[PDB]
Amino acid sequence: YQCHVCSAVLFSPLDLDAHVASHGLHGNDIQRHITEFISSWQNHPIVQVSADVENKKTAQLLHADTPRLVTWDAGLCTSFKIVPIVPAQVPQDVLAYTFFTSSYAIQSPFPEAAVSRIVVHTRWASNVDFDRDSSVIMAPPTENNIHLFKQLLNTETLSVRGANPLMFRANVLHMLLEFVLDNLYLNRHTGFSQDHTPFTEGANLRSLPGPDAEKWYSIMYPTRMGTPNVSKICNFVASCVRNRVGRFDRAQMMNGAMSEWVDVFETSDALTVSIRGRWMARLARMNINPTEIEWALTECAQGYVTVTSPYAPSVNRLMPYRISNAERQISQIIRIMNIGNNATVIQPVLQDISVLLQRISPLQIDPTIISNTMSTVSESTTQTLSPASSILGKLRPSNSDFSSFRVALAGWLYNGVVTTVIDDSSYPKDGGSVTSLENLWDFFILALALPLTTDPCAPVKAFMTLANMMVGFETIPMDNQIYTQSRRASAFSTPHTWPRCFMNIQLISPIDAPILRQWAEIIHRYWPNPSQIRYGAPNVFGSANLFTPPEVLLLPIDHQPANVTTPTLDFTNELTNWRARVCELMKNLVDNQRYQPGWTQSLVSSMRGTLDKLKLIKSMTPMYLQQLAPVELAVIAPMLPFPPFQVPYVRLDRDRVPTMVGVTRQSRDTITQPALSLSTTNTTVGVPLALDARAITVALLSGKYPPDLVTNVWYADAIYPMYADTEVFSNLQRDMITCEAVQTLVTLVAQISETQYPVDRYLDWIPSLRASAATAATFAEWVNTSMKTAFDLSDMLLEPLLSGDPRMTQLAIQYQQYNGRTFNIIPEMPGSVIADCVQLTAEVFNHEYNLFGIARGDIIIGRVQSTHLWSPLAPPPDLVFDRDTPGVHIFGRDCRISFGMNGAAPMIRDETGLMVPFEGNWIFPLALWQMNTRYFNQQFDAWIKTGELRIRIEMGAYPYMLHYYDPRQYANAWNLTSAWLEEITPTSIPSVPFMVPISSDHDISSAPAVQYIISTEYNDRSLFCTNSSSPQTIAGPDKHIPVERYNILTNPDAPPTQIQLPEVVDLYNVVTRYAYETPPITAVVMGVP
Amino acid sequence: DHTPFTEGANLRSLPGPDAEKWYSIMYPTRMGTPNVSKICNFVASCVRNRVGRFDRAQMMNGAMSEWVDVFETSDALTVSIRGRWMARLARMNINPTEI
Amino acid sequence: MKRIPRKTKGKSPATTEPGTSNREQYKARPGIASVQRATESAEMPMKNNDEGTPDKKGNTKGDLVNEHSEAKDEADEATKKQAKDTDKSKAQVTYSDTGINNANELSRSGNVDNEGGSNQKPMSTRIAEATSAIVSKHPA
């Protein structure tokens, strides 16, 4: 078989139909495929699959820790479910619908019970493919929910049950974040079925997957059930309008008979619908079409190959990969912070990159060139004393390790984190002397190898080496009375050590120091010049550059267009000219023997001959370094997992030499504690790295090309697999996630401490403490873990931010020049959909807190005996008192208690200082009871139980738990309240117990009941309906169906898309469902003649 | 502090075994005052915010603070003696560049 | 319907057209497998660095060592690993014992917490230590 679209060869028509799907051609099957590449000059396709698959058979790997962005849901886009609380059964006059002979039962859309309530249960009716596994599941209030408010810092509590009031805000923020995370899904389009039930004739109902979908019809579409009987539910149904049900609108575009998208009326909550709409918008903004992929890869290839990705016209081909430069910069900053001066972290990257260069370059290292050029044996020479033999001994040409050279090349890409130097061992032993033939070769090797290092202080070391070797023969003045000429060369490591006798040539006397003057002039004049080079595809891939323009790559060496026919002895090339200058200098040093007394024989001839052979050695390394190597670096750099991070090279200018690199977490308008990052503690700009000069010199002198090299063919072969195994796109997605997570972290953590970050606050009424560094650190840890599990991450994400004081405001990175000028780069932070959705959830929670099991306000403890059935949640006004009520007593932290003697009533201290007895109406902050729970509990219980003492406890917000009871019997609540008061703990508080009378649909008698705890404001928003199956409620709390929730059904004039956020959520509204295609990355690599 | 006794102050941790007991001696103001006894009267008249850590100098992120200032039980005499003692060492201090 | 398992634990007519014959007479240069093996190593993301950060309980992770000592030890580990990859007894490229006097270098370790204090005693231990020094019990 054959696929003409991509010229691939297959074997199965089924596999042919599967493969044409990646070409946009539907079936007219290995979704594991991530990328599919194929060459044009050979038969060798390459595919990539996820690293977690258990069958790597003839496939490459994708080791990037990519997140899971696209996930689908076929269930109901709802998170609130109605649950019965007190079951009830009542007789009915109509039992079942009747057709010709068969009959069908009646299925109500709502529970048929005495009372029912709304409970939060994320994805309780969903049907997902991949699970975010961050569900928030509440329990009905008749049960205990205390454990959902103590997952956070409540570690060393004094009670297993109960929560710490100082961390409700932290726990609630974490809960809201999980609520947002668990709903990040795409509404999948599914099948339908035309209905002909008389109440909903002609509707197009949506059908859930799995067996027996129609069991869900009663839940989805309330109007489907008729109006058989007289009851709350039947009246509610009679209120609704018929037409708004089932399918509402559909796309014009369709494949086969399946519409592309559809709009449907179905049961759902507005909150999650809005959240998923925002998620859809965010993903849609990242779409990419394959043509710009062609552009990006072609430009990225530096014009050595051309890429083509044919495709068919479509609009639902979603390939989310486009992000902004700011997110890439933020992610790069995070990656840099991850290092933390850990050499073990950085070493593998450099080693692997060096190996990759070694295995892709046409250059070959061959010391036999050196050996043949020297052509010296000198057998049986006990005292050789010959320059050729000594230089061969130093070079040690036969040995082949050359990791130093490739690592030196690789270091250029990471100038900003690691600095390459020459190990101090390579320097002459004990400084050395010009009188030694041994030390001359060390100087030669070191001088010839220095320029390739990234050390900014290399030229000073090069000069100071010869200055050290010349002590006693040739003297120069020292500016500093401390530092002498004999100061070791390898110590001049920082710009502040540069001698003025070197900066200003004129201070070197040509009479007192001819050779030093010449050497200084040579260094000034012929030291290599840095340059620049373009790379990458900024218009599509963005750029992670920070201190450089986005599309440029810095080099310490000038570069030229590639041309193989270049002459070897082209002195225009900077490296060759440098070698020639060094050789000529050593020559001029050695002719007259002014500096080598104690040589018995005139070694001038042999010395000069060896220097000439080295000067004119016809190696091809400088050619490669000037032409080919920059091209290879440009090709590789965009593909790397760690994008390049450079700091500008200045050849000899001193005052602009960089010396320090730091990271900042605070904004520019805050005066805070100076907390420098660890990276600033390095003596050099980056982590020191030592190289071997000998290997670099051997590489520079023993380079050659294959005798049949053709650049086009070689580089096409090199690029094809490297790009076939690319991982850029996963990196882009991860970077977007990282920026999102950082913004979410700052936004949340700003709401539990004092940070001058300008952000609206809506959970201030929730009590909490003032978070310190450790508390914020633990909270940030929980946030980080939640996010990592949400998107199925396993590698680093926000870990470097947790080192110290996570009370941050904004990322920023900067570096410093020697002359004090600093460059500060602050990425332009874009929006964050997750943080905005969390804020919206906070808005809603500020009105719908009862659905989450939180009660707002205060409570009043006091005996009340009566037969009325007013619910505790909504007490009559004439039972409560506030701070602004005549005759009340307010209390502060000073609340000393004095026993009265000889029958005098015991007394307690008012806030104003007056002394009052145990009766009346009081106000306590809850902390006061927490301070002395045992003492107050011992002192007050009798008066509260039998006397006339009532206390209002200032709480702000608190969890609550209900205890339904039959009003027809006697009922005393003293036991529950006493138990609650006993378990008050300096670090914990149990949920507040409330007693509520069960509503009745028929006349009943009443019996006395005794309460002790009532709320201070309305808290029954969670109540849905009472006695739903009966015509009306006779006694007890009464509540009809909350019509305003079903606005689009009950309000005839409401437009279909209207919502009532953020004060009321709707339980029935319009939902859009899609069905997209996510084809793999397809490419065809073509060669360039 | 995880308890409402103080307004989330920072409490210094002593080393060695049986260390909680020190928490009730270091900070007298942390005790609750339910009683009318002499000690509770004394505590009730004191300022609250002067307890625990007062100030610190955190220079490098991810490292120990250079020094801190804290309220705790002590005596002025030994505080002064260790004060002028430290100054003598500070006068004798030198740094690696001079070395 | 389809489901995808997670990789991390969670909360819980003739047809032979005349151009399809194969003449695999071309050998790539450089070889495909050779380049693939090299780029496989470069694919791998950099290792995580959890040390010095708090955990689920609140106690920081790491070992109780001086920061400078930790940085030096990490440098030695890097040099040893570098020697290991090059199949040599002594690494030609060394991250330790260089010319530079990097004596002020610091590395993140588990010795110090976020407050700048010492981790001689864990965070949770100190919190329990403090909070238990204030509890009161039932009267005699």
Q: Which DSSP state fits C118? A: B
- Around Cβ B64, how many Cβ atoms within 10 Å? 17
A676/B contact by beta carbon, under 8 A:
yes
Residue in A664, A681, A896, A984 to test binding to B, most B beta-carbons within 10 Å: A896
Place of tokens 């011992």: A938
A772/B1 Cα distance (integer angstroms) = 10
Provide the 10 A C-beta neighbour count for residue A816.
17
- Which pair of structure tokens corresponds to residue A179? 């609520």
Q: Is beta strand A35-39 parallel, antiparallel or unpaired with respect to A204-206?
A: unpaired
CB-based contact B3:A930 (threshold 8 Å): yes
Are B59 and A674 inside 8 Å of each other by CB?
Answer: yes
CB contact under 8 A, C98 and A690: yes
CA distance to A104, A892, A963, A1016, per residue, from A951 (Å)? 57, 14, 22, 12
- Please identify which residue in the block is written with the tokens 């602009």: A656
Strand A8-9 and strand A2-3: the pairing is antiparallel
Determine the Cα angle at B29 with ends B24 and B35, to 5°: 90
Q: Does B60 touch chain A (CB under 8 A)?
A: yes
Q: What are the backbone angles phi and psi of residue A262, rounded to the nearest 5°?
A: -155, 150
CB contact (8 A) between residue B33 and residue A894: yes
The nearest alpha carbon in chain B to A987 belongs to B3
Nearest to B44 among A340, A678, A894 (CB): A894
Query: Per the CB < 8 Å rule, is A986 touching B48?
Result: no
Inter-residue contact A28 to A22 (CB < 8 Å)? no
Residues forming a β-bridge with A60: A48
CA angle A670, A671, A675 (to 5 degrees): 105
> Which 3 state secondary structure label does DSSP give A838?
helix
* Torsion sign (Cα): B62, B63, B65, B66: negative
C134 vs B19: CB contact, 8 Å cut-off? no
Rounded to a whole number of angstroms, the distance from the CA of A771 to the nearest CA of chain C is 12
Contacts of B24 in chain C (CB under 8 A): 133-134
Helix, coil or strand: residue A550? coil
| CA atoms of A749 and A12, how far apart (whole Å) | 56
Q: Is A473 exposed, middle or buried (0-12, 13-18, 19+ CB in 10 A)?
A: middle
| Backbone φ, ψ for residue A491 (5° rounding) | -90, -25
Q: At A533, which helix (H) or strand (E)? A: strand A531-534
Distance of alpha carbon A113 from alpha carbon A964, whole angstroms: 14
CA–CA gap between residue A315 and residue A313 (Å, rounded): 7
**Tokens, residue B91:** 């006068």
Q: Which residues contact A661 (CB under 8 A, 6 or more apart)?
A: A416, A417, A647, A679, A680, A685, A686, A813, A814, A815, A816
For chain B, give me the number of helices (H) and strands (E)?
A: 3, 2
Q: Which residue of C has its CA nearest to A136?
A: C11
Contact B60 A678 (CB under 8 A): yes
Q: Mark out the alpha helices in A616-670 (DSSP H runs).
A: 621-636
Torsions phi, psi for A854 (to 5 deg): -100, 135
- What is the C-alpha end-to-end distance of chain C, expressed in Å? 66
Q: Closest chain C residue to A425 measured between Cα atoms?
A: C99
Contact between A219 and A109 under an 8 Å Cβ cutoff? The reply is: yes
How many helices and strands in chain C, by DSSP H and E? 3, 0
Question: Is the CB of residue A805 less than 8 Å away from at least one CB of chain B?
Answer: yes
Q: What angle do CA A124, A69, A761 make, to 5 degrees?
A: 70
Distances (CA, A) of A90 to A112, A237, A1002: 9, 19, 11
Neighbouring chains of B at 3+ CB pairs within 8 Å? A, C
Q: Which residues contact A158 (CB under 8 A, 6 or more apart)?
A: A985, A986, A987, A988, C131, C132, C135
Q: Which helix (DSSP H) or strand (DSSP E) does residue A448 occupy?
A: helix A437-449
Instruction: Answer yes or no: are the C-beta atoms of A1036 and A155 closer than 8 Å.
Output: no
A615-645 per-residue burial string, b: 16 or more CB within 10 A, e: under 16: bebebbbbbbbbbbbbbbbbbbbbbbbbbbb
In chain A, residues 764-803 whose CB comes closer than 8 Å to chain B: 769-770, 772, 803
Q: CB-based contacts of A500: which residues, under 8 Å, 6+ apart?
A: A479, A507
Tell which of C48, C114, C123, C124 to mutate to test the A interface (max A CBs under 10 Å). C114
CB A116 within 8 A of CB A1031: no
Give the 3-state secondary structure percentages of chain A, helix then strand then coil, rounded to 5: 35, 20, 45
**In chain C, which residues are last before a break of more than 2.5 Å from C to the next N?**
12
Q: Name the packing angle between helices A833-845 and A728-749 (round to 10°).
A: 30
Whether the Cβ atoms of residue A518 and residue A509 lie closer than 8 Å to each other: no
Q: Is A691 exposed, middle or buried (0-12, 13-18, 19+ CB in 10 A)?
A: buried
Give the C-alpha distances (Å, rounded to integers) separating A633 from A420, A541, A627, A922, C39.
Answer: 17, 17, 11, 77, 14
CA distance from start to end of chain B: 44
B64/C134 touch (CB, cutoff 8 Å), yes or no: no
Alpha-carbon span A442 to A457, nearest angstrom? 19
- The widest CA-to-CA distance across chain A, in whole angstroms, is 132
Q: Is the peptide bond before A1062 cis (omega within 30 degrees of 0)?
A: yes
User: 3-state DSSP call for residue A486?
Assistant: coil
Closest CA to A745 of A323, A329, A174, A65: A174
Contact B3 C134 (CB under 8 A): yes
Report the DSSP pairing between strands A35-39 and A1081-1087.
parallel
Nearest residue to A425 via CA among C22, C39, C90, C108? C90
What is the Cα–Cα distance from C138 to C140, expressed in whole angstroms?
7
What's phi and psi for A60, nearest 5 deg? -85, -175
Expressed in Å, this structure's resolution amounts to 3.3
Task: Name the DSSP letter for residue C109.
Answer: -
CB < 8 Å to A793, chain C: 8
Contacts of C61 in chain B (CB under 8 A): none
Phi then psi for A747, rounded to 5 degrees?
Answer: -60, -45
**A612 torsion bin: left (phi>0), alpha (psi -120 to 50), beta (else):** alpha
Asked if the Cβ–Cβ distance from B8 to A936 is below 8 Å, we say no
DSSP tally for chain A: helices H, then strands E: 28, 40
Those chains having 3 or more beta-carbon pairs within 8 angstroms of chain A are: B, C
Closest CA to A801 of A960, A677, A926: A677
At A492, is the secondary structure helix, strand, or coil? coil
Q: Is B31 exposed, middle or buried (0-12, 13-18, 19+ CB in 10 A)?
A: middle
Q: What is the Cα–Cα distance from C13 to B98, expressed in whole angstroms?
A: 95
**What tokens appear for B46 in the block?**
């004191």
| Residue B10 dihedral angles phi and psi, to the nearest 5° | -100, 125
Residue spans of beta strands (DSSP E) within A30-112:
35-39, 46-50, 60-62, 72-73, 80-87, 97-98, 103-104
Tell me which residue in C121, C131, C133 faces B15 most closely, judged by beta carbons. C121
Token pair for A569: 């002895």
Judge whether A673 is closer than 8 Å to chain B, CB to CB.
yes
Contacts of B21 in chain C (CB under 8 A): 133
Neighbouring-strand partners of residue A907: A898, A917
Test the C interface: residue of A342, A425, A931 with most C CBs within 10 Å:
A342
Return the H-helix or E-strand segment holding A134: none
Evaluated on CA atoms A947, A952, A955, A961, the torsion sign reads positive
Instruction: Find the residue in B nearest to A907 (Cα).
Output: B36
Please answer whether residues A24 and A317 qualify as being in contact, where contact means their C-beta atoms are separated by less than 8 angstroms: yes
Q: Which residues contact A589 (CB under 8 A, 6 or more apart)?
A: A434, A515, A595
* A925 closest CA partner among A895, A966, A953: A953
A9, C20: Cβ pair inside 8 Å? yes
Q: Which residue of C has its CA nearest to A680?
A: C105
C106 vs B2, B56, B63: nearest CB: B63
Residue indicated by tokens 């990425």: A827
Those residues whose C-beta lies under 8 Å from the C-beta of residue B4, and which sit 6 or more positions away, are A165, A166, A927, A930, A931, A986
Question: Does B59 sit within 8 Å of A676, measured CB to CB?
Answer: yes
| Residues of A whose CB is below 8 A from B33 | 893-896
Q: Show the DSSP H helices in A591-620 as ranges.
A: 604-615
- DSSP letter at A906? P
CA atoms within a 13 Å half-sphere pointing along the CA-CB vector of A32: 17
Contact A798, A806 (CB under 8 A): no
Which residues lie below 8 Å from residue A552, measured CB to CB, with a gap of 6+? A532, A533, A534, A535, A545
What backbone phi and psi angles, to 5 degrees, belong to A1048?
Answer: -65, -20
Cβ proximity of A441 and A590 under 8 Å: no
Cβ–Cβ contacts within 10 Å for residue A75, how many? 18
Other C-beta atoms closer than 10 Å to the C-beta of A795 total: 13
Contact A348 C47 (CB under 8 A): yes
Interchain contact, B4 vs A156, CB within 8 Å: no
B32 interaction partners in chain C (CB closer than 8 Å): 134
Residue B8 to residue A769, Cβ atoms within 8 A: yes
In angstroms, rounded to a whole number, what is the distance separating the alpha carbons of residues A610 and A605?
9
CB A765 within 8 A of CB A781: no
Distant-in-sequence, close-in-space partners of A691: CB < 8 Å, separation ≥ 6:
A404, A407, A408, A420, A421, A422, A423, A453, C92, C93
Alpha carbon of A214 to those of A125, A219, A660: distances in Å?
14, 10, 69
Burial bucket for residue B40 (CB in 10 Å: 0-12, 13-18, 19+)? middle
Nearest to B62 among C52, C118, C120 (CB): C52
Using the Cβ of B6 and the Cβ atoms of chain A, whether some distance falls under 8 Å is answered with: no
- What residues of A are in contact with residue B62 (Cβ under 8 Å)? 340, 678, 803-804
Of the candidates A942, A936, A943, the one whose C-alpha atom is nearest the C-alpha of residue A917 is A943
Tokens of A178: 């999980």
- Which residues are within 8 A (CB) of A464 and not within 5 positions of it... i.e. 6 or more apart? A487, A489, A492, A499, A502
Residue type, A37: F
Strands A889-890, B68-71: pairing kind: unpaired
In the structure encoding, which two tokens stand for residue A808, read together?
């941050």
CA dihedral of A694, A695, A698, A703, whole degrees rounded to 10:
-160
Mutate to test the interface with B, among A893, A915, A924 (most CBs of B within 10 A): A893
Q: Which of A848, A840, A843 is nearest to A1024 (CA)?
A: A848
Query: Cβ neighbours of residue A771 under 8 Å, at least 6 residues apart?
Result: A170, A749, A752, A753, A779, A807
A678:B58 CB<8 A: no
A38 touches A1084 (CB < 8 A): yes
Please, are residues C83 and C91 in contact by the beta-carbon 8 Å criterion? yes
In angstroms, rounded to a whole number, what is the distance separating the alpha carbons of residues A517 and A513?
Answer: 6
Query: Which of C17, C21, C49, C82 to mutate to test binding with chain A, by most A CBs within 10 Å of its CB?
Result: C49
- Token representation of residue A267: 């049961």
Q: What angle do CA A347, A352, A356 make, to 5 degrees?
A: 150
- Locate A374 and state its tokens: 């020297």
Of A153, A805, A987, the CB nearest to B3: A987
Closest to A236 measured CA to CA, from A847, A1067, A1003, A870: A1067
Residue B71 bridge partners (DSSP)? B52
CA dist., res. A958 & res. A951, Å (int) = 17
Please tell me which of the candidates A772, A805, A931 has its beta carbon nearest to residue B5: A931
Measure CA of the first residue to CA of the last residue in chain A; give whole Å: 29
Radius of gyration of chain C (CA): 28
Strand-pairing partners, residue A960, are: A992
CB contact under 8 A, C52 and B63: no
Q: Do C130 and B24 touch (CB under 8 A)?
A: no
Contacts of A942 (CB under 8 A, 6+ apart): none
As a whole number of angstroms, the distance between CA A757 and CA A216 comes to 47
CA A1014 to chain centre: 46
Shortest distance between the Cα of A192 and any Cα of chain C, in A, equals: 15
Q: Is A272:A135 a contact under the CB 8 Å cutoff?
A: no
In chain C, which residues have their Cβ closer than 8 Å to the Cβ of B30? 134
